[PDB]
Write a protein that binds this ligand. Structure first.
Ligand SMILES: Nc1nc2c(ncn2[C@@H]2O[C@H](COP(=O)(O)OP(=O)(O)CP(=O)(O)O)[C@@H](O)[C@H]2O)c(=O)[nH]1
Ligand SMILES: [Cl-]
Ligand SMILES: [Cl-]
Ligand SMILES: [Mg+2]
Length: 715
């Protein structure tokens, strides 16, 4: 529907910008593909990457446009199919920035799962409107053999669960967001077998759930697909209940744009005004063989045209648009111009990165950053196979990191090697593949290792740090953050920019003494610095330097130069030299670093390692094989439930223990165990493993091969 798409994209009221989101494997891509087939867009089309087809997983968000007719008018559905695996969660985040509505897909059998909540929360954070498609209802009918009422109960429990999540996330918006099957905001069906129903649709066609069960039970789901077409029921739901750009954009900018809402551009964004100045939110960078580098984004105001110039936020020179169009899976349909309200593919924006604001005016308030979180937990060292390829590798790693901001690329100064840090083993496997196959650089990679965290287990101090000229002294106590306070900081509930009586009240109503709440001076990662001193001359002008020493230590702790978390650092006393020449950065910053590092080692310094939480659905026949695999990897079982022939195992294990788990769990269960994973958190390494783990880390970093001591820091 090439000419259809183009005619429709000019009319913002008939557009739906949507994303398909779900727990891994609940059926996003089958849904998206069969929506496209039913709609006559195609005869898995969206998993068009080779590794996606090879591994049977969505790795990258894919974009496609779809024409659907509803009550005598055609609508343009700009759809994003997103990945389910936690390692690719940043693809979901970037996609939620670009869409206005979301089809939350949930497997009827497993029901809502941990990444179901994750994707729902990411949608609501962006003021994206959710509807619900309960998929795999064929399995629920054919494998559990439940009566209609049992199946009404099961489906209704899923709806209720999604609604509790919504109500917990957006309590004041709950009424308008609540999912109601009788209203039509929920459908149920089988993406695989091209059929779907909803309460209003069943009334309309005169078909009950008992007839639906018969269709499946008598091996006639093809007939059901004709009577109850998947694409009709779901696309209708999309048109009816997901919002157009005209309703939505004013809601999106409440949370993605902190500029003057009554400005010229705030109005033209709020009105989807094609004649306004360009306002284009860049959500993705990727490379194609013909278009070259391509920026994906959401156009809120203006019109994009080949040859038009836009400014990129933070960059001085104006970028020129070379081509504009829409993605159709692996293809990108080119068009003369695209108007506000659409999800666009643009070439020629050399300076754009994920999160960029493209605008006509250089002085436009930039859109809010695309939030990240989830710091890397797995790392690999990477090197060019042939030394003639070193500068290509430099340029290629820059490009890989630009296209995937969840990857962190640093350089080992003690080996000249590049380190790739990402979300998991699979994440790094794909990256190494996308450097060789796609970027044409032969590389060698080390085995994946985890990134640890350093912390303390007890209180210590006051410890005296002394400047190299011996003229300045700082007295530091250190101890663990209480869990309530750690959570406030990790969730961003407090801040030094925040108001001082407000922050003091949040901290104190969390357990912190008034002394320490009012003394809090700095936050850095999941650590705080408190000033407990009164009336020390020159400490005000010197405190900025003390905090720099604190920040440096947080970046890499004294045990193994791993990042530090969970620390409460307190300045109890200080002595500074009268003359500023004796108390500048070269004097104060080392004194601060050394006091803090010595206190840490005196406070039961130890390592935390990342843990994954693992969910396994396995038939009873293979339960024993599943159990042996997780228990053999020193994982702890957390709970176990039975639901018919299936055992549901909830377990945790160190990330470091779960490398190669996919292939081993398949072998031990003959491929019959479904499993998924999520980051749990950093937990203490075994107490009898601290010396060996620290030595292991220091050796592979090039650091000195000896256990650090507080005598290394304070003379
Ligand atoms: N029985 C049944 N199987 C389905 C249905 N929908 C999808 N599947 C199956 O589930 C598996 C995963 O399907 P897929 O569309 O790739 O799910 P996905 O959520 O996109 C996977 P990922 O999270 O990695 O992107 C496939 O074997 C697919 O055939 C359904 O309605 N019924
Ligand atoms: Cl605390
Ligand atoms: Cl002062
Ligand atoms: Mg998929």
């Amino acid at each position: 529907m090439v000419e259809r798409v183009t005619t429709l994209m000019d009319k913002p009221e008939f557009i739906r910008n949507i994303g398909i989101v779900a727990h891994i494997d609940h059926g996003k891509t089958t849904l998206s593909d069969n929506l496209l087939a039913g709609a006559g867009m195609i005869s898995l089309f969206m998993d068009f990457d080779e590794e996606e087809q090879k591994r049977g997983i969505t790795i990258d968000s894919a974009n496609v446009s779809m024409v659907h007719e509803y009550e005598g008018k055609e609508y343009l559905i700009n759809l994003i199919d997103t990945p389910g695996h936690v390692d690719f969660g940043g693809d979901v985040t970037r996609a939620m920035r670009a869409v206005d509505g979301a089809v939350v897909v949930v497997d009827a059998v497993e029901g809502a799962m941990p990444q179901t909540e994750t994707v729902l929360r990411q949608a609501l954070r962006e003021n994206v409107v959710p509807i619900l498609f309960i998929n795999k209802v064929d399995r629920l009918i054919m494998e559990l053999k439940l009566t209609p009422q049992d199946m009404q109960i099961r489906l209704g429990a899923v709806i209720d669960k999604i609604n509790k999540l919504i109500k917990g996330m957006k309590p004041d918006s709950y009424d308008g967001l609540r999912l109601d099957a009788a209203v039509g905001k929920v459908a149920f069906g089988s993406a695989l077998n091209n059929w779907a129903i909803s309460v209003p649709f069943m009334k309309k066609t005169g078909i009950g759930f008992k007839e639906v069960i018969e269709y499946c039970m008598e091996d006639q789901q093809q007939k059901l697909a004709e009577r109850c077409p998947l694409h009709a029921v779901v696309n209708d739901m999309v048109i009816r209940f997901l919002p157009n750009p005209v309703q939505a954009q004013k809601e999106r900018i409440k949370v993605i744009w902190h500029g003057d809402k009554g400005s010229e551009i705030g109005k033209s964004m709020a009105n989807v005004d094609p004649n306004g100045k360009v306002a284009l939110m860049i959500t993705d960078i990727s490379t194609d063989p013909h278009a070259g580098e391509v920026a994906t984004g959401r156009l809120f105001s203006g019109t994009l045209e080949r040859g038009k110039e836009v400014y990129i936020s933070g960059m001085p020179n104006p970028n020129r648009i070379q081509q504009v169009g829409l993605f159709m899976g692996p293809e990108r349909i080119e068009v003369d111009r695209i108007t506000a309200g659409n999800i666009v593919a643009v070439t020629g924006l050399a300076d754009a990165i994920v999160g960029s604001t493209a605008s006509t005016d250089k002085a436009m308030v930039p859109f809010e950053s695309i939030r990240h979180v989830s710091e890397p937990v797995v790392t690999v060292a990477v090197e060019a196979k042939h030394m003639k390829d070193l500068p290509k590798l430099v340029e290629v790693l820059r490009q890989v990191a630009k296209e995937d901001p969840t990857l962190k690329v640093t350089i080992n100064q003690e080996t000249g090697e590049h380190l790739l840090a990402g979300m998991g083993e699979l994440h790094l496997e794909i990256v190494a593949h996308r450097i060789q196959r796609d970027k044409h650089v032969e590389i060698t990679t080390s085995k994946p290792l985890v990134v640890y965290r350093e912390t303390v287990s007890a209180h210590a101090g006051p410890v005296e740090g002394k400047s190299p000229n011996r003229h300045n002294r700082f007295y530091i106590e250190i101890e663990p953050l209480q869990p309530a306070i750690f959570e406030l900081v990790r969730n961003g509930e407090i801040s030094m920019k925040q108001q001082e009586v407000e922050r003091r009240d949040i901290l104190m109503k969390a357990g912190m003494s008034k002394e320490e709440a009012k003394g809090i001076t700095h936050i850095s990662e999941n650590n705080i610095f408190i000033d407990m001193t009164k009336g020390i001359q020159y400490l005000n002008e010197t405190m900025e330097l003390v905090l720099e020493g604190f920040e440096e230590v947080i970046k890499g702790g004294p045990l193994s130069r791993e990042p530090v978390m969970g620390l409460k650092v307190k300045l109890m006393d200080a002595k500074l030299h009268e003359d500023s020449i004796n108390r500048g950065p070269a004097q104060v910053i080392p004194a601060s670093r050394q006091a803090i590092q010595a206190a840490m080692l005196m406070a039961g310094a130890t390592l935390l390692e990342p843990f994954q939480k693992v969910f396994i659905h396995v038939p009873q026949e293979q339960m024993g094989g599943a159990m042996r695999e997780i228990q053999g990897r020193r994982g702890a079982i957390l709970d176990m439930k039975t639901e018919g022939d299936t055992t549901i195992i909830e377990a945790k294990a160190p990330v470091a223990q779960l490398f190669g788990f996919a292939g081993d769990i398949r072998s031990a269960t003959e491929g019959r165990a479904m499993w998924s994973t999520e980051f749990l958190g950093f937990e203490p390494i075994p107490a009898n493993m601290l010396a060996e783990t620290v030595m292991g880390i220091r050796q592979r970093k090039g650091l000195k091969l000896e256990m650090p001591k507080p005598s290394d820091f304070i003379s």
